[PDB]
Amino acid sequence: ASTEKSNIIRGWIFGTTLDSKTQSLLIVNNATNVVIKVCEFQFCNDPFLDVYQWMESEFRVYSSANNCTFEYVSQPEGKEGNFNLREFVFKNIDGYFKIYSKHTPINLERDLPQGFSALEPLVDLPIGINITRFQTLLALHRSYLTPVDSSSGWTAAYYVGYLQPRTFLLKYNENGTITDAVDCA
Amino acid sequence: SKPSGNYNYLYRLLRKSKLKPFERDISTEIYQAGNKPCNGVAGPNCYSPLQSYGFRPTYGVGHQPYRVVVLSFELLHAPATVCGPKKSTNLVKNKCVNFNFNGLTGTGVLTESNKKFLPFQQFGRDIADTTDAVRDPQTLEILDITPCS
């Protein structure tokens, strides 16, 4: 979950060791399309997306990609406009990678507001990856180009929560929307 | 299969942990079975986990290569695209008729209610899990399934 409005967070990575020895999931969201590829990406110590600013983005998050057994481009995926809190639920069970999303306007201070906001299903595709680690991809936008070297110019606000198997009691409204829930545990 | 031996198939004889359903492990690392850290080379405590097959036509039935095809489909009630060679009829209204939208057979009356279904929702069930509302696959209107007299 995050409340930024400058398109900083626009992708994530998933994998076990985040190297070329094992498979890794690369999901990047652009301004007009989304790229999802499963390949042996050699993730560096500090993966980030480069920009030559407006266009011509460079994927400096990996060093090599050879196998590349699965690719997916949907271009409807996660931006939900630019005008605030976009919540996401990532699930990987039985080899299927489930993604949920929801756009909720924020009219409060810099904190998680009360109420309920159910997330809608987004995509369900099989990757068959033993995902144990992940990292958020963010565009630096340091007004100029930057090499593949890690620890770039960070000088020039997202929440992370872990899911657990829990039993819930969902209450549906008259219009079919979920307005309340109860965590039994 | 080849009479001289087809070595284009592996089966990962050894692995550190049991694999989960619907996963793929194509790692070619050396399986470290001993305590000494294996440096990527074959040794007395770490060998190659990927073993090759000895497919030869001289072997009897049971050791020959058998191609296995697993068709994993989802029959859950949801907006689908593959719906066989089943053809379509017209849409009658306010009468006791049969309905077969996506394999869901039964008998009821269509009323064209005002239920607001989401794009990922096509079927609606009641307390008894009986489908009382469906989304037409062709037309984006919502139709309720009410039992007849």
Partner: peptide, 18 residues
């Protein structure tokens, strides 16, 4: 860099498509 907060009543999603 890192802070700790609590989610009061958020994190719910539609389990099925019914």
């Amino acid at each position: 860099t890192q802070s700790y907060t609590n989610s009061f009543t958020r994190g719910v999603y539609y389990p099925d498509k019914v």
